[PDB]
Amino acid sequence: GSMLLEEVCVGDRLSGAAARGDVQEVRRLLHRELVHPDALNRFGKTALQVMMFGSPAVALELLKQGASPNVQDASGTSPVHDAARTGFLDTLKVLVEHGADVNALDSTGSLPIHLAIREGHSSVVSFLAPESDLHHRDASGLTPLELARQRGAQNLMDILQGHMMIPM
């Protein structure tokens, strides 16, 4: 016959729940529903890929199971990429710090930090600064410090400048 193997019913399950931002569902989900971390929606995205970096505990819940945060789709945009430009330094750092691929890029070659710089989240930008490739630069020719000089939302280039390194 055709279509005899289906493993999506559980996909979007935890995927739509964790992304919808519901620490209550994400909690009882694994603690009860034992939902899988690789759960993929109809399309084919992981929970972390859809996650709304809303509830901090929700992030740890997903990663607590066994999901691969190193996922990219359409313009190579992983959880870190969205969490940055979106504005969720809360759950962002949780996963970002844990391991979340916060170094990759979105095809063009812009580090998740660059986006935060053009945003002006203040915390996110300065945060994603040291939590990224403190050296790489966009195809344009700007780095964490340079981009900070552009979108001078405030003491941007200052935060990244200090955390940068400068051992002299």
Secondary structure, 3-state, the chain: CCCCCCCCCCHHHHHHHHHHCCHHHHHHHHHHHCCCCCCCCCCCCCHHHHCCCCCHHHHHHHHHHCCCCCCCCCCCCCHHHHHHHHCCHHHHHHHHHHCCCCCCCCCCCCCHHHHHHHHCCCHHHHHHCCCCCCCCCCCCCCCHHHHHHHCCCCCHHHHHHHHHCCCC
The experimental method behind these coordinates is NMR
Domain count, the chain: 1
Q: Which residues have CB under 8 Å from 148's CB, separation 6+?
A: 117, 125, 156, 157, 158, 159, 160, 161
Residue 137 and residue 141: Cα distance in Å, rounded? 6
Range of 77's domain? 1-168
Residue 65 and residue 71: Cα distance in Å, rounded? 16
- CATH number, domain of 93, equals 1.25.40.20
